Coordinates of C-alpha atoms in Angstrom, one line a residue:
Chain D
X1 CA 108.2 101.4 86.3
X2 CA 109.1 98.9 83.7
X3 CA 109.7 96.2 86.4
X4 CA 106.6 93.8 86.2
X5 CA 102.9 93.7 85.3
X6 CA 101.3 91.9 88.0
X7 CA 101.5 89.0 90.3
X8 CA 99.2 86.8 90.4
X9 CA 99.2 83.9 92.6
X10 CA 101.3 84.8 95.1
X11 CA 103.5 83.5 98.5
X12 CA 105.1 85.2 101.3
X13 CA 105.8 88.5 101.5
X14 CA 107.8 91.3 103.7
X15 CA 107.6 94.9 103.5
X16 CA 108.9 97.1 105.9
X17 CA 112.9 99.0 106.7
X18 CA 112.5 102.4 105.0
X19 CA 116.5 102.6 105.6
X20 CA 118.9 104.3 103.3
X21 CA 122.1 102.0 102.3
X22 CA 134.2 106.6 98.2
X23 CA 131.9 104.1 99.6
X24 CA 131.2 100.5 99.0
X25 CA 128.5 97.8 99.9
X26 CA 129.1 94.3 99.5
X27 CA 126.4 91.5 99.2
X28 CA 126.1 88.1 99.6
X29 CA 123.0 85.6 98.8
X30 CA 122.5 82.2 99.5
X31 CA 119.8 79.7 99.9
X32 CA 119.7 76.4 102.2
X33 CA 117.7 74.1 103.1
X34 CA 114.7 76.8 102.3
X35 CA 116.4 79.2 104.1
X36 CA 117.3 82.5 102.0
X37 CA 120.5 84.0 103.9
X38 CA 121.8 87.4 103.0
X39 CA 124.9 89.3 104.2
Chain Y
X1 CA 66.0 81.8 107.4
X2 CA 65.2 83.7 110.8
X3 CA 66.8 85.1 113.7
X4 CA 66.0 81.9 115.7
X5 CA 66.3 79.6 113.5
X6 CA 66.8 75.8 114.7
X7 CA 69.4 73.6 114.9
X8 CA 69.6 71.4 111.7
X9 CA 68.6 75.0 109.5
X10 CA 70.4 77.6 111.3
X11 CA 73.5 78.8 109.5
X12 CA 76.4 77.2 110.5
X13 CA 79.8 78.9 110.5
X14 CA 83.0 77.0 110.2
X15 CA 86.5 77.2 110.1
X16 CA 88.6 74.7 108.5
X17 CA 92.5 75.7 108.7
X18 CA 94.6 73.1 107.2
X19 CA 97.5 71.6 108.9
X20 CA 100.5 71.1 106.5
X21 CA 104.2 70.9 106.9
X22 CA 106.8 70.2 103.6
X23 CA 109.8 71.9 101.8
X24 CA 107.5 74.9 102.1
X25 CA 108.6 77.2 105.5
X26 CA 107.7 74.9 108.1
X27 CA 107.8 77.4 110.9
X28 CA 106.4 75.0 113.6
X29 CA 106.7 75.9 117.0
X30 CA 105.8 75.1 120.7
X31 CA 103.4 76.4 123.1
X32 CA 106.6 78.0 125.3
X33 CA 104.8 80.3 127.4
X34 CA 107.5 82.9 129.0
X35 CA 108.5 82.3 132.9
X36 CA 110.6 84.7 135.2
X37 CA 114.2 84.9 134.9
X38 CA 116.7 84.3 137.8
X39 CA 120.4 84.3 138.5
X40 CA 123.1 82.7 141.2
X41 CA 121.7 79.8 141.3
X42 CA 122.0 75.8 139.8
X43 CA 118.8 75.9 137.2
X44 CA 117.4 74.9 134.1
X45 CA 117.5 77.1 131.0
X46 CA 115.8 76.8 127.7
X47 CA 117.1 80.1 125.8
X48 CA 115.5 79.7 122.3
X49 CA 115.8 76.0 122.6

């Protein structure tokens, strides 16, 4: 796990949805007026 | 201190929750207590605004 060392000062958190997923998985990300929309 | 400390000397627990609203998520709502639902009648509705 060579991702990160720590977090120190932090902000909003969310950890949930233990759900899984010849096949394709499209992904669209955008942020406007502070709302991070994902499709 | 003592179990029966008088006013002005006994412990004083305080909560000072601060109000703010800026570019940070402005998650401000109203005291909208949910009410009953009716149908088949001319009525005024507020569905999530």
